[PDB]
């Protein structure tokens, strides 16, 4: 996250870490047993961390569980990272609290201005490097299509929103891939792309999750 703020400890209770020996991805817990993230974030031997803050420090709250099956979309396209959405099912349940808790699916699409919280473990530096230890948090509106196909020319598809400013200076950036971007109490947004971080006029991208609530609970329902 570039430009954000420091959430505070267990403030985004749903937020979970992908790791396989550092932090490599975000994610949402959805409930006790799955996560949704982005598809380009598979890889195996991941490990999900659950009720984390700084995740260089085992602080108390943690539950370090084993991903049992990652299930990327069927129809994801690594070029145009259409699609870019994983579930993935836990080895065992979460032990849901005020630390740890999921987030609700949409029942309908956000419209353009609405305010949504983006988290992350990402860099936050627009210009280098800088992995923060604790969470960071970012409040930034859904923009609209139109101002997003024009920043990004026939690479905008149906699944796909832009979010924050196009002033540049906040934004999310690598390593809150798969994070969650969540209006009013929804899981609207998984952080997929953008060009750089936090720059003039090249707003993030992200996966429109409300486009594919059929296929979550379809899909968890037969696994
Ligand atoms: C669809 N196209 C073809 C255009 C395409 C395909 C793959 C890609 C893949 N490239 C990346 O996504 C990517 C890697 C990366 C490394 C650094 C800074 C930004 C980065 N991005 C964008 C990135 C990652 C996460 C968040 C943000 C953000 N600024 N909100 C930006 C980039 C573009
Ligand atoms: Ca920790």
Not at 69 to 81: A, E, Q
Not at 196 to 204: F, V, Y
Request: charged share 10%; net charge positive.
């Amino acid at each position: 996250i570039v430009g954000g703020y420091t959430c505070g400890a267990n403030t985004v209770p749903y937020q979970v870490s992908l790791n396989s020996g550092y932090h490599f991805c975000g994610g949402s817990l959805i409930n006790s047993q799955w996560v949704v993230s982005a598809a380009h974030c598979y890889k195996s031997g991941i490990q999900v961390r659950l009720g984390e803050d700084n995740i260089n420090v085992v602080e108390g709250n943690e539950q370090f569980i084993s991903a049992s099956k990652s299930i990327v979309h069927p129809s994801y396209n690594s070029n145009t990272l259409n699609n870019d959405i994983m579930l993935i099912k836990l080895k065992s349940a979460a032990s849901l609290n005020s630390r740890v808790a999921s987030i609700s699916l949409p029942t309908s699409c956000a419209s353009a201005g609405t305010q949504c919280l983006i988290s992350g473990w990402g860099n936050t530096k627009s210009s280098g490097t800088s992995y923060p230890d604790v969470l960071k948090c970012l409040k930034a509106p859904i923009l609209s299509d139109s101002s997003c196909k024009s920043a990004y020319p026939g690479q905008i598809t149906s699944n796909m929103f832009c979010a924050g400013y196009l002033e540049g200076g906040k934004d999310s950036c690598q390593g809150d891939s798969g994070g969650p971007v969540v209006c009013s109490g929804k899981l609207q947004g998984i952080v997929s792309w953008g060009s750089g971080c936090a720059q003039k006029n090249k707003p993030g991208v992200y996966t429109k999750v409300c486009n594919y609530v059929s296929w979550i609970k379809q899909t968890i329902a037969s696994n």
